[PDB]
Amino acid sequence: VPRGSHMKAVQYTEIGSEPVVVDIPTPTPGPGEILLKVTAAGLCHSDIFVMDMPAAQYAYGLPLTLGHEGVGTVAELGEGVTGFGVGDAVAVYGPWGCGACHACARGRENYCTRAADLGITPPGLGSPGSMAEYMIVDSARHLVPIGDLDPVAAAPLTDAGLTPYHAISRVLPLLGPGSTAVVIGVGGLGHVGIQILRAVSAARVIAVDLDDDRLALAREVGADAAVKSGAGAADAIRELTGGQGATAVFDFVGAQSTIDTAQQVVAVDGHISVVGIHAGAHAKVGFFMIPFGASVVTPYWGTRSELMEVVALARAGRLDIHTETFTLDEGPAAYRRLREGSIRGRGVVVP
Amino acid sequence: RGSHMKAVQYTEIGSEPVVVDIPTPTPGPGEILLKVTAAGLCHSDIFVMDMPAAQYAYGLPLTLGHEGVGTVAELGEGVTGFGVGDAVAVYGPWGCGACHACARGRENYCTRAADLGITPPGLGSPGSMAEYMIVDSARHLVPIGDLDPVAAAPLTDAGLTPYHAISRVLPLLGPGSTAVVIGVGGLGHVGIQILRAVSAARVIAVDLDDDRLALAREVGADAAVKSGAGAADAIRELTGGQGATAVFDFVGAQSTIDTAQQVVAVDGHISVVGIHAGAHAKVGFFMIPFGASVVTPYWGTRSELMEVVALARAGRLDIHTETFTLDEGPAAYRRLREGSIRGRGVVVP
Amino acid sequence: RGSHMKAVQYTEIGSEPVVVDIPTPTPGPGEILLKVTAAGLCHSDIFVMDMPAAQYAYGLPLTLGHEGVGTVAELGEGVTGFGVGDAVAVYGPWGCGACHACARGRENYCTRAADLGITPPGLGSPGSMAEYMIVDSARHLVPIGDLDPVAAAPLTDAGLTPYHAISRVLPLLGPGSTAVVIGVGGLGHVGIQILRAVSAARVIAVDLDDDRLALAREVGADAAVKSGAGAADAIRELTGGQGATAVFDFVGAQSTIDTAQQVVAVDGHISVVGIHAGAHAKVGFFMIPFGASVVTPYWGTRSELMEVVALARAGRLDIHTETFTLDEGPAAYRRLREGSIRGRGVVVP
Amino acid sequence: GSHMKAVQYTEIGSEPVVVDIPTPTPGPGEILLKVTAAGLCHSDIFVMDMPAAQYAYGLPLTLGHEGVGTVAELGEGVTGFGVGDAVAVYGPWGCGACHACARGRENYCTRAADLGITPPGLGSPGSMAEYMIVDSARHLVPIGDLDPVAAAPLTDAGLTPYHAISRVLPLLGPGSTAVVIGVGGLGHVGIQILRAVSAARVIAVDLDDDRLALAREVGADAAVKSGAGAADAIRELTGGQGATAVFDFVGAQSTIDTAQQVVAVDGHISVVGIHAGAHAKVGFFMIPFGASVVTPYWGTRSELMEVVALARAGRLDIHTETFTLDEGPAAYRRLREGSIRGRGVVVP
Amino acid sequence: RGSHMKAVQYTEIGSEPVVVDIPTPTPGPGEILLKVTAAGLCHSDIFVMDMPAAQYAYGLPLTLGHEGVGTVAELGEGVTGFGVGDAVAVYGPWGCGACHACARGRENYCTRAADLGITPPGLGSPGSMAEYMIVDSARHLVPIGDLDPVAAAPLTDAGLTPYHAIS
Numbered sequence A: 001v002p003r004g005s006h007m008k009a010v011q012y013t014e015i016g017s018e019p020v021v022v023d024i025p026t027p028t029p030g031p032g033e034i035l036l037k038v039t040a041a042g043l044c045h046s047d048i049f050v051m052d053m054p055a056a057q058y059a060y061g062l063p064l065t066l067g068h069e070g071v072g073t074v075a076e077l078g079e080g081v082t083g084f085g086v087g088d089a090v091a092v093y094g095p096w097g098c099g100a101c102h103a104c105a106r107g108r109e110n111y112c113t114r115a116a117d118l119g120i121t122p123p124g125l126g127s128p129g130s131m132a133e134y135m136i137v138d139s140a141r142h143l144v145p146i147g148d149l150d151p152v153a154a155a156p157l158t159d160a161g162l163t164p165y166h167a168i169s170r171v172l173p174l175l176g177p178g179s180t181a182v183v184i185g186v187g188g189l190g191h192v193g194i195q196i197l198r199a200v201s202a203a204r205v206i207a208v209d210l211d212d213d214r215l216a217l218a219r220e221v222g223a224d225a226a227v228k229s230g231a232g233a234a235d236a237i238r239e240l241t242g243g244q245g246a247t248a249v250f251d252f253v254g255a256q257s258t259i260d261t262a263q264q265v266v267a268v269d270g271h272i273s274v275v276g277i278h279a280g281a282h283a284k285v286g287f288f289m290i291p292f293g294a295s296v297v298t299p300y301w302g303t304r305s306e307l308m309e310v311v312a313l314a315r316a317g318r319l320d321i322h323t324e325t326f327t328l329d330e331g332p333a334a335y336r337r338l339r340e341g342s343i344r345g346r347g348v349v350v351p
Numbered sequence B, C: 001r002g003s004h005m006k007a008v009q010y011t012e013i014g015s016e017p018v019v020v021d022i023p024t025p026t027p028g029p030g031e032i033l034l035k036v037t038a039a040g041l042c043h044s045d046i047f048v049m050d051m052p053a054a055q056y057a058y059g060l061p062l063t064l065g066h067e068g069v070g071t072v073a074e075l076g077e078g079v080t081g082f083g084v085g086d087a088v089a090v091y092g093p094w095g096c097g098a099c100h101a102c103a104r105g106r107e108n109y110c111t112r113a114a115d116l117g118i119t120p121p122g123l124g125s126p127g128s129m130a131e132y133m134i135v136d137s138a139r140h141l142v143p144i145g146d147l148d149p150v151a152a153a154p155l156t157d158a159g160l161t162p163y164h165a166i167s168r169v170l171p172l173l174g175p176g177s178t179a180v181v182i183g184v185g186g187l188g189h190v191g192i193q194i195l196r197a198v199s200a201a202r203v204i205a206v207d208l209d210d211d212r213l214a215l216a217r218e219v220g221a222d223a224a225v226k227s228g229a230g231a232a233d234a235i236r237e238l239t240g241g242q243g244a245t246a247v248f249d250f251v252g253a254q255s256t257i258d259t260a261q262q263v264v265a266v267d268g269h270i271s272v273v274g275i276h277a278g279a280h281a282k283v284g285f286f287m288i289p290f291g292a293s294v295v296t297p298y299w300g301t302r303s304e305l306m307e308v309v310a311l312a313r314a315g316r317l318d319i320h321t322e323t324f325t326l327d328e329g330p331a332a333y334r335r336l337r338e339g340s341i342r343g344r345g346v347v348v349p
Numbered sequence D: 001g002s003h004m005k006a007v008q009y010t011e012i013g014s015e016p017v018v019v020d021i022p023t024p025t026p027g028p029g030e031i032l033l034k035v036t037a038a039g040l041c042h043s044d045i046f047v048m049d050m051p052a053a054q055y056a057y058g059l060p061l062t063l064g065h066e067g068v069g070t071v072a073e074l075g076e077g078v079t080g081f082g083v084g085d086a087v088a089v090y091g092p093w094g095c096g097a098c099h100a101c102a103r104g105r106e107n108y109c110t111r112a113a114d115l116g117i118t119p120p121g122l123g124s125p126g127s128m129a130e131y132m133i134v135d136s137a138r139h140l141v142p143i144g145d146l147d148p149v150a151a152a153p154l155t156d157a158g159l160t161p162y163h164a165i166s167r168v169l170p171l172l173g174p175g176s177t178a179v180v181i182g183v184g185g186l187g188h189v190g191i192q193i194l195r196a197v198s199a200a201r202v203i204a205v206d207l208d209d210d211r212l213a214l215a216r217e218v219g220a221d222a223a224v225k226s227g228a229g230a231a232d233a234i235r236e237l238t239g240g241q242g243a244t245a246v247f248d249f250v251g252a253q254s255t256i257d258t259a260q261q262v263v264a265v266d267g268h269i270s271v272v273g274i275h276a277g278a279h280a281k282v283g284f285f286m287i288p289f290g291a292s293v294v295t296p297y298w299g300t301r302s303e304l305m306e307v308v309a310l311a312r313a314g315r316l317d318i319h320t321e322t323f324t325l326d327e328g329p330a331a332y333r334r335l336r337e338g339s340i341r342g343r344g345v346v347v348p
Numbered sequence E: 001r002g003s004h005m006k007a008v009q010y011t012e013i014g015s016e017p018v019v020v021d022i023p024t025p026t027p028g029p030g031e032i033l034l035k036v037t038a039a040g041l042c043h044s045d046i047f048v049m050d051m052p053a054a055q056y057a058y059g060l061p062l063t064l065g066h067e068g069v070g071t072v073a074e075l076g077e078g079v080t081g082f083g084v085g086d087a088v089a090v091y092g093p094w095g096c097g098a099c100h101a102c103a104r105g106r107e108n109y110c111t112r113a114a115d116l117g118i119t120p121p122g123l124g125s126p127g128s129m130a131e132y133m134i135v136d137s138a139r140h141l142v143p144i145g146d147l148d149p150v151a152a153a154p155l156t157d158a159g160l161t162p163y164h165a166i167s
């Protein structure tokens, strides 16, 4: 469906400004590229992060069509492109890579050692994004078929699904029967994390959050236990495990305090994944500051096969994110709502 | 036999060890008695003795020596698996044997060993630095065959420790990968040898000492650069700016840990093997590459120990030893303290 | 404790088992004595009893029962790490404890056991189908807390055996995988449940009996196929002709293996878990997809058994029991022959 | 199940939250109850309104000092209760071996401070959880087939007023007059108690006319609106002779002032209501001769069994509003805004 | 003593009985649990085994043996009229106890028994061919004193049936 010549989009146009709707030219797919008609485009707290970057630290980028969480159908194929038919429902894999280094050749393109130098950026974070009537994707490599899954349900999974899934997959061998996984932060990512831990592992899930509401929600989504986050959370958790320390801690908050709890509750030979972002917050990995053999990493999005697996969980009804639907023209309005945390789960814009 | 034996002991806090006379122990049921063939020293024996009285609970007196090698002297009851006169190495980090971690083969990460007050020989249990010692269980004995006991003693630590640190991420270290070893002291020295024997990875060494760097090349580092402010850059120049798959910090200083974070590749790995009270890696967004994982590993597994012995017997590992007598325990520790030992000190009674 | 006990025993080749009187055994040093709380019986008991005299060296008489649970009755000398009256299940496949294989977890694959004549209880050593049982080492007992010993018993084999077979290729069984289970009889039943619990793969059940199929659906199979010459194409129909990531053949018959070679995916896996003397996969070019690997797993590891226990304690494994009495031992073995027992038979003194 | 929901106070100045904790195990001498009702009370608000400054060694804390449940498992050696038995939890635990306790006045134990014997839900695990530990058998009183929901408030709002009255019951012969200040809440169970255990005249005093009218229906022989006109009003009703006993459940300086002006010679003032700072002023000519004042504390075990007996004989009725355990923190909010009719009770 | 017990059941249509080893029943309120002393076989228990899937209206499994004699092992709650160890024969054609026909002793002609699903021991209820047995009520036990159980068993049908026919 390329028909248009002109298309609607939401762009970040000026540093520190709010995003604005625009009428820009309808792109045309070059050789090797695919042009999608967008069916859903996701908001994310990551989006405010980049728009909150100061003018001092700004080099290049603008204008920028936002939206890294992209779903659509195939509109027009570029030269030489096969492996998709016009109409095929695809999700846009976010973390673009060179395709040619060792990492990309193992599926792990989110860890491409070349994207940096070659200035390969993801859609809606340096490349034209999903929040528009149409979109370009650089390679068929970056399309995952979703069949008849509702695009509104798919969009949030390209991040809120993939991100935690990758975090969990890094250590899924250690999450055998009898293991214990602590999920800190039952917001967007932690919500879907629990659902995941339930599908792919036999581990026992203990949830940690601030809000009382978030605790009972956690139990409903498959957490076997829930404690309140603070100075007391460490003890609270240990109490439950019979003082055994937890196999894996997935910290989807990523605050200093939450990292600190993670360290206090992680098992010997365990693992801590710092998934959420609070600038400056870090784990302190040194002797007698963390159990022996306890590994810590800040992982980053996910691999292609992982996103493929995410969709399978979705299609099998195993994942479910609370989704609230908006309109291209309400784009700015939606981002405003995001800033005030007046959205449960995930805002999704539908051209 | 004899009902008395010479032993080196840490007897009072903040004091130097001393040659003492104590009774020759007798092997309970399950236990094994060894005649010690070789008993190693390392700076780890120094780190413990430098704990202040303020933090002293219930340790002393303590026969020193975690690096244990010997020959089977007398089987306790029911023990089989070794005939008397068998050469065995004493596996260090003892565990319950019954927890999940122990049943996976990773005894060094036993979840109950702390609770049950199970401590390793020379760090809480009678050490190897004596004429005889008891091993609680035949589970903690590795046959070494005709391997030289003096050779084998360093390997129980200086061999096993780095082998573990490496094994943790050995799938990552395929051809085309770069591994950086910081601290070509005792551990680093054997680290390099292992890296060469078990992987095709490129090895870049980092150290303070010119001479250490030269010897790093000899044992098989492709390149060597000086530790310091500019070591990060130095490494990147060598790697065309690509950054290293794995970094094995055997120094463990804040400086080194810092260097390691500046040179680790995305999705790579840092392994903080050296102890410096208070030095830590800061793992957070934009303070380290995505996917780079950090860990402080602890000694090694029993299977690991067996593999180290195998490398040694095939002639693939090699550390310079300095041989002392029981009565030189104190002497040797002092030499160790001034760092006038190249490689590893080994007591032979 | 009395000087007598009964035991079900195979006393002569070709014979039937008999309830017999024999000395109650006493624990030596390192041994544990158990009051048997349950003693499961499986088809492989019938397998060994069917071996002819022609091929026979030694072994008689034999207390039957390789699936055993009990309570600690008396501790041998020097045996700590277990209270009297503790409920414990007995790790089946004993090994040396000192070989590389054992030092890793994988005792079931011990390289020495055959040479030192270390046989499993019920298969060359005093079994569980008796009032009292000797276990050689502590490391062969797994705590079961308050799990029902009658539930526990089939888990030591009908649980352990599939769990291991699946564990071997569990990383292949992510979302979107298909796992095929041929045989829903006893082992196969618990396999489905395991797959549901430790993976997210789709489960396709295959059997000869339609009532077993409908119960395979109950425990979590996403599809049922009838075993036969029609089974292969039907499985392909289910998978849109993509093939199955792994095929777990718990039947082990030539027709089942043949079925498996057809439906298995490229880079897939076949686990031949059931025994039919002679049945064998034909792994060679164009007779099986490229990268499809085949294995005959043997039983399982201590760590796995611990995990199998955790599942049951958490409610995720439910095998149907039919209990008999110690006197009824031979009766049950007759009932087992005529496929005449629902699920797993357990004897209970 | 090896864990259970529990309504806990986790950090000073915050709201309570339903968290998951280990289902405790009854030691030798302890009893495990499956809780069947847990009362909330304004006393619960008082404790969580204490500033961190005045806080040392409390948290976390399962709340709920008004407990009733069923015996779930008997600890070692504990004899004299059966599984399934319905019991109310005695609040103010004591040493059991000092004079005060040996007399049966556990609420007045002289060692309990020094032993850190704190009551359930005010320093020890409370009743607002699926299950409960009670330290010894002497702290359970059977309730038979009494509705636990009706029971629960009786462990505090029944016991507390009963003790207050019990202390001076000899003086409440026919012809005596008892004034009750503060009808809602404790004073509602007070009036009922007065009518059952005595034949005194009962004079209700409140601010809310609605509570006053329903105090009549429960056995108040007269009503008066609290204020600076309260004294005069009450004198008017006794012909100036004053009241034998004033039971002030409000506990304000205002109410205590009214009281001191209306009590009879050789009478008594029981200050049951807690208003920090509020105090009677007992000195010559600032109060009638022979008028005694006291701040009473909860009640005795015997007294509790008596309060149970009254309720089982249908002599005590208090309006309960049911909440769920999940609604623990929610209910605490409602109490905070005085929008609870009578006494709230959580049912796991 | 004995939480397990031996029994003989018809287990499914077409085939022949088997020696199943099922659980030892317990006497509910008003029931009596007997140690079986003798269990009779009859050409009755083979006419019921030759019923073709369709007609058969009992339900399996089915401990056989409607000719049953025993000793009082354990009394159920509030069951007076018998002591432990009393030698007793089992009255077969159980009835409601409440209808006119039952009120006259003729339980064998109970007009409710069919409708209320009351069925004779070993002919719809657990029978006598076992180590133990339950009798639903004390009214279905007839004392046999010192009569040889082996001799008594057949009477509960081989005697009673013609006796009634003749009476």
Ligand SMILES: NC(=O)C1=CN(Cc2ccc(CO)cc2)C=CC1
Residues within 6 Å of the ligand: A046, A049, A159, A163, A274, A275, A276, A277, A298, A299, A300, A301
């Ligand atoms: N732990 C992670 O990888 C996260 C991935 N995203 C996308 C994203 C992309 C870029 C940034 C830049 O700061 C942050 C976040 C969503 C949540 C956290």
Ligand SMILES: NC(=O)C1=CN(Cc2ccc(CO)cc2)C=CC1
Residues within 6 Å of the ligand: B042, B044, B045, B047, B066, B157, B158, B161, B272, B273, B274, B275, B296, B297, B298, B299
């Ligand atoms: N990183 C490790 O586990 C190392 C093993 N050893 C034995 C030992 C163990 C523990 C300590 C105190 O930490 C020191 C020494 C040798 C060097 C470091």
Ligand SMILES: NC(=O)C1=CN(Cc2ccc(CO)cc2)C=CC1
Residues within 6 Å of the ligand: C042, C044, C047, C048, C066, C123, C157, C161, C272, C273, C274, C275, C296, C297, C298, C299
């Ligand atoms: N594939 C396996 O290892 C199985 C484990 N068992 C115990 C067993 C089985 C077969 C043998 C060889 O007779 C030995 C022991 C039960 C079924 C199959």
Ligand SMILES: NC(=O)C1=CN(Cc2ccc(CO)cc2)C=CC1
Residues within 6 Å of the ligand: D041, D043, D046, D156, D160, D271, D272, D273, D274, D295, D296, D297, D298
């Ligand atoms: N006057 C009393 O004794 C009261 C008993 N309680 C329990 C309570 C109350 C006050 C305290 C001190 O904060 C402690 C405990 C309920 C109402 C008033």
Ligand SMILES: [Zn+2]
Residues within 6 Å of the ligand: A042, A043, A044, A045, A046, A068, A069, A159, A160
């Ligand atoms: Zn996002």
Ligand SMILES: [Zn+2]
Residues within 6 Å of the ligand: A097, A098, A099, A100, A101, A102, A103, A104, A109, A112, A113, A114, A115
């Ligand atoms: Zn790349």
Ligand SMILES: [Zn+2]
Residues within 6 Å of the ligand: B040, B041, B042, B043, B044, B045, B066, B067, B157, B158
């Ligand atoms: Zn050392």
Ligand SMILES: [Zn+2]
Residues within 6 Å of the ligand: B095, B096, B097, B098, B099, B100, B101, B102, B109, B110, B111, B112, B113
């Ligand atoms: Zn252990």
Ligand SMILES: [Zn+2]
Residues within 6 Å of the ligand: C040, C041, C042, C043, C044, C066, C067, C157, C158
């Ligand atoms: Zn078996």
Ligand SMILES: [Zn+2]
Residues within 6 Å of the ligand: C095, C096, C097, C098, C099, C100, C101, C102, C107, C110, C111, C112, C113
């Ligand atoms: Zn072995």
Ligand SMILES: [Zn+2]
Residues within 6 Å of the ligand: D039, D040, D041, D042, D043, D044, D065, D066, D156, D157
């Ligand atoms: Zn209260």
Ligand SMILES: [Zn+2]
Residues within 6 Å of the ligand: D094, D095, D096, D097, D098, D099, D100, D101, D102, D106, D108, D109, D110, D111, D112
């Ligand atoms: Zn006292």
Ligand SMILES: [Zn+2]
Residues within 6 Å of the ligand: E040, E041, E042, E043, E044, E045, E066, E067, E157, E158
């Ligand atoms: Zn008959």
Ligand SMILES: [Zn+2]
Residues within 6 Å of the ligand: E095, E096, E097, E098, E099, E100, E101, E102, E107, E109, E110, E111, E112, E113
């Ligand atoms: Zn009738």
